[PDB]
From TrEMBL:
GO terms for molecular function: alpha-L-fucosidase activity. Alpha-L-fucosidase is responsible for hydrolyzing the alpha-1,6-linked fucose joined to the reducing-end N-acetylglucosamine of the carbohydrate moieties of glycoproteins. One of its GO terms (biological process) is fucose metabolic process. It is an enzyme of class 3 (hydrolase). GO terms for cellular component: lysosome. The keyword Signal applies. This is alpha-L-fucosidase. It holds the Pfam family Alpha_L_fucos. It comes from Bacteroides thetaiotaomicron (strain ATCC 29148 / DSM 2079 / JCM 5827 / CCUG 10774 / NCTC 10582 / VPI-5482 / E50). Residues 1-345 form the Glycoside hydrolase family 29 N-terminal domain.
């Protein structure tokens, strides 16, 4: 056991009502919106294939010239109530919003920098408007915050000199200032999700990551903080030197997921995955034809996969520069919402079931020890194999959307065939199981 001043603060999972709400929510939306939405991946007549929110980097745009995009920031179609309605209809229980991305442009009118929505033609507090509108629909709001900031020259990727140390200290104070500000202006914030924390400068300043977490928890009672922020005394990131999760939940499953057989370790801690609809675009990119674009069922599969392994999933949207959503995103939100309305009982407030993974889909476990079978792959055999842990029996099976009774047949020791339904539900569907221990 290695002694640490700034290692993990939680032992096991938090179970206060704030964390249980964070967990029960399960399905989130991500909003990446900033100046990058104006060029939409194109600069000086070249369309760049990389992620649009990184266009400053791909097109090698100097800060002062990138930040002039502010003179074109005028999202006249923006209506926060309509954004919140689109979220509510999708079934999203929370939204994670880029308060500021790597570019450093702020969606709220910060007093600590001029690179904010206040100094645009639109002028309005986009963030405040969203927080209110989402909250009025019953949707929790989480703040994405990039520590790395391309707009502040005091930022340093590493500390290799007295000059570096002096500058980066000014940068941490500035960061501190923005964080206190966000927490005090928007006290309904439920989470801060730090990103752009990978540089050696943050690793050397692990003390600060611990301070930021503690500062925010005092200012916002119950607030969640992600593991990405954190490094310990030894410079060890995410999980401390004693193997313990730092922050409140693990956050490294970005555009990927743990394996349902090999990675059951993730069930021991809270965690949240995120994903894009195209292969790798968070902010608005004008041309989605340049990579593969996931269909709604492919996205739902990923959502259910996360919940089946005790994790949340956050699906990204990159709104247009005019304040509206592209057609592909509207279609996606609508399709997810249609599905969650019918089958969300197997997602919201659900968790890892402890059953061996089967080919037809995923198990999830409800608050009242219900076990849901979520079927993505329909067997031609008309039989869904269920292997139970030792000492566990299956008693009933019911179609979730029709109440229709479902045959259960014992096939061997600890194994059942659960019949499918008489009519193919025709999309991924859900069977609830009653189970009994010894
Ligand atoms: C949500 C997205 N986060 C990006 C930065 N993070 C990464 O690209 C990333 C991708 C996969 C895994 C990780 C990361 C990442 O930083 C990170 C830190 C610690 C553990 C795992 C990861 C940003 O660069 C993107 O613009 C977008 O905001
Ligand atoms: N573990 C529960 C039974 C159970 C097991 C797995 C489940 O997915 C649900 C319920 C008990 O001790 O009674």
């Amino acid at each position: 056991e290695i002694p640490l001043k700034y290692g993990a603060t939680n032992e096991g999972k938090r179970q206060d009502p704030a964390m249980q709400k964070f967990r029960d929510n399960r399905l989130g939306a991500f909003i990446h919106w900033g100046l990058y939405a104006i060029p939409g991946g194109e600069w000086n007549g070249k369309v760049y294939g990389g992620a649009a929110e990184w266009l400053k980097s791909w097109a090698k745009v100097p800060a002062d010239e990138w930040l002039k995009l502010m003179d074109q920031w005028n999202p006249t179609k923006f209506d926060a109530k309509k954004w919140a309605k689109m979220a509510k209809e999708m079934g999203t229980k929370y939204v994670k919003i880029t308060t500021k991305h790597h570019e450093g442009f702020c969606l709220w009118p910060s007093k600590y920098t001029k690179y904010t929505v206040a100094n645009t033609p639109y002028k309005r507090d986009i963030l405040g408007e969203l927080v209110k509108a989402y909250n009025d629909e019953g949707i929790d709001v989480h703040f994405y915050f990039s520590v790395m900031d391309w707009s502040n020259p005091d930022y340093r990727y590493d500390i290799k000199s007295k000059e570096d140390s002096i500058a980066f200290s000014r940068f941490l104070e500035f960061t501190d200032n923005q964080l206190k500000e966000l927490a005090t202006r928007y006290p309904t914030v439920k989470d801060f999700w730090f990103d752009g924390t990978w540089d050696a400068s943050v690793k050397k300043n692990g003390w600060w990551t611990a301070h930021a977490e503690q500062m925010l928890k005092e200012l916002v009672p119950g607030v969640a903080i992600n593991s990405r922020l954190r490094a310990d005394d030894k410079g060890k990131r995410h999980f401390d030197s004693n193997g313990r999760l730092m922050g409140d939940y693990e956050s490294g499953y970005e555009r990927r997921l743990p394996d349902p057989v090999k990675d059951l370790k993730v069930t021991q801690w809270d965690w949240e995955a995120c994903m894009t609809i195209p292969e790798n675009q968070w902010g608005y990119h004008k041309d989605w034809s340049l990579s593969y674009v996931k269909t709604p069922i492919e996205v739902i599969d990923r959502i259910v996969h996360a919940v089946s392994m005790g994790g949340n999933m956050v699906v990204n949207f990159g709104p247009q520069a005019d304040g509206d959503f592209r057609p592909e995103e509207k279609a996606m939100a609508t399709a997810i919402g249609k599905w969650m309305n019918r089958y969300g009982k197997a997602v919201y407030a659900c968790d890892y079931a402890g059953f061996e993974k089967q080919d037809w889909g995923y198990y999830t476990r409800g608050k009242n020890d219900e076990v849901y079978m979520v079927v993505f792959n329909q067997p031609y055999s008309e039989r869904l194999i269920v292997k139970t842990p030792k000492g566990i029996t299956v008693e009933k099976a019911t179609l979730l959307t029709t109440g229709e009774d479902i045959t259960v047949v014992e096939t061997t020791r600890n194994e059942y065939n659960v019949s499918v339904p008489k009519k193919n539900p025709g999309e991924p569907y859900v069977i609830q199981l009653k189970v009994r221990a010894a």
